[PDB]
Amino acid sequence: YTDVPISGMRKTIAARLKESVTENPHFFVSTNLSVSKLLKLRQALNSSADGRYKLSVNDFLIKAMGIASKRVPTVNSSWRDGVIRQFETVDVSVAVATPNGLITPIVKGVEGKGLESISAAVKELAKKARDGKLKPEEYQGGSISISNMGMNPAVQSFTAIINPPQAAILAVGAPQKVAVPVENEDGTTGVSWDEQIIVTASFDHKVVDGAVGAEWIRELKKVIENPLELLL
């Protein structure tokens, strides 16, 4: 009936996603991260401030992605002319939802940067993405991506398409209350309510195998569920 035409900008993104799904054989690895200690650490770090900063879960996730990509360097790679290009630093592309679609500004040098610097760079790039004032060197590049959907409480889990020429992409669902067993100080078991987040990582099988993706997911889960390991 109504036949509004394609903008032309959508055609390049459609061809790019076509390239991604036709040259990257994707496989997904799902996990559930417990963030009950991460939320307490974020609450303490936000309460011990004078309005200098404001921390979110995405800052801890980007720092944990940097730590996990430094520990497993096979995921921090690409696919080039007969050659695998392996980087040292973790450059994390963060997806920002604008009314003109999707853009991925890059936070450069994630490992050894600082949570306040990460929060400042994410806020700068997000407000500049909403104003539409970016340079091509700010959204062209990166070694790993992350898609965030925590503001929507309906999305329990979702998958994402890998932006070429990267090798992996993360997808973070809304937190939910999951029943987790607990021992009391006597012999019986109990019911405790834990805040869990379903995290799905999509890997390219030409670069990352299933054991390498499982090791990356295990290190990410370790750094998330033990928040004091973000110091190291």
Residue numbers in the entry: 227 to 458
Paper text:
E2 then covalently links this acetyl group to CoA through its catalytic domain. Without exception, the PDC is organized by non-covalent recruitment of E1 and E3 to a large core built from E2 catalytic domains.
We therefore carried out separate recombinant expression of N. crassa E2 core-forming domain (tE2) and His-tagged PX variants, which could be co-purified by Ni-NTA affinity following brief incubation. The C-terminal domain of PX however appears to bind to the icosahedral assembly of fungal E2. To confirm that this binding localizes to the E2 interior, we collected single-particle cryo-EM data of a reconstituted tE2 + PX recombinant subcomplex. The reconstruction shows an interior density that under icosahedral symmetry (i.e., when over-symmetrized) appears identical to that observed in the endogenous preparations. The overall resolution is better, likely due to the absence of the PDC exterior. However, we are not able to find a tetrahedral class of particles in this or any recombinant preparation, which we attribute to a decreased occupancy and order of the interior assembly compared to the endogenous preparation. The increased resolution of the E2 region may also dominate alignment and increase implicit symmetrization, further de-emphasizing the interior component and obscure the sub-symmetric interior. The appearance of the over-symmetrized interior nonetheless unambiguously shows that the interior density observed in the native PDC reconstruction can be accounted for by the C-terminal domain of PX, namely the core binding domain (CBD).
